[PDB]
Amino acid sequence: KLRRVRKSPPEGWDLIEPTLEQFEAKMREAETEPHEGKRKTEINWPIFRIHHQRSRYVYDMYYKKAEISRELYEFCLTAKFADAALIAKWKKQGYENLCCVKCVNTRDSNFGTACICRVPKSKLDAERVIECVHCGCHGCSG
RNA sequence: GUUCUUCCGAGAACAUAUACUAAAAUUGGAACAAUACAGAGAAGAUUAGCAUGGCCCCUGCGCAAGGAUGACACGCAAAUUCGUGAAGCG
Ligand SMILES: [Mg+2]
Ligand SMILES: [Mg+2]
Ligand SMILES: [Mg+2]
Ligand SMILES: [Mg+2]
Ligand SMILES: [Zn+2]
Ligand SMILES: [Zn+2]
Ligand SMILES: [Zn+2]
């Protein structure tokens, strides 16, 4: 990754490097863990889950905590440490807990609806438990 | 879950219906390798090649071409119907 961004990490990369380096360890384990004893839908879920976490950590450091400068935050977007297109959603009102961009692509669904996990729980038959097939998200709206 | 309201623990807006839903459990359907036998179209033999037909395939990208002429075919073929005189009887 860092080879492919040419400039050096700008300012306080040491604050985020040990955490990002742990997400890398997580992601490689998720790639190589056996697909046996798991649903054909389940095995992809940790990938989307870890990719959500890592993007969320970079995002929270810059926006909520302000512990990294914009140049270091934008560096993480440039170095593909965080998905700019997922962070682009968490800025939108009503999307601030979105699990993955695949769940808001309405075009890919049979009827042109969003994913069911995007329905607010108060609008469900709220005893109902959800695990959406795209990522196992139980509900990510309200 | 977030941006706001305040009399204050509630209210407005944003957000709005994934998935042949199984890690399964059941249930049909093709060709395989070879002991011994007798062995591959045309009025004697060696026998071309190309056609023809249907509820028969295979190889091939194929309206090309190969697969024994790819194999088969291989006869009670009656399918619109009679007409005659002798000789027994009774
Ligand atoms: Mg011949
Ligand atoms: Mg031929
Ligand atoms: Mg031949
Ligand atoms: Mg023939
Ligand atoms: Zn999702
Ligand atoms: Zn979903
Ligand atoms: Zn979701």
Swiss-Prot record:
Name its cellular compartments.
Nucleus
Extract the InterPro entries matched here. BUD31 (IPR001748), BUD31/G10-rel_CS (IPR018230)
Main location as per UniProt: nucleus
GO CC field = spliceosomal complex
Q: Does the keyword Protein biosynthesis apply?
A: no
| Alphabetic keyword roster | mRNA processing, mRNA splicing, Nucleus, Spliceosome
Ion transport as a keyword?
A: no
Q: Which GO terms describe its biological process?
A: mRNA splicing, via spliceosome
Sequence motif: Nuclear localization signal, positions: 3-7
According to its UniProt entry, what is the function of this protein?
Involved in pre-mRNA splicing process.
Complex formation: Identified in the spliceosome C complex.
Q: Which family does it belong to?
A: Belongs to the BUD31 (G10) family.
The name of this protein is Protein BUD31 homolog
Organism placement in taxonomy: Eukaryota, Metazoa, Ecdysozoa, Nematoda, Chromadorea
The gene for this chain is: bud-31
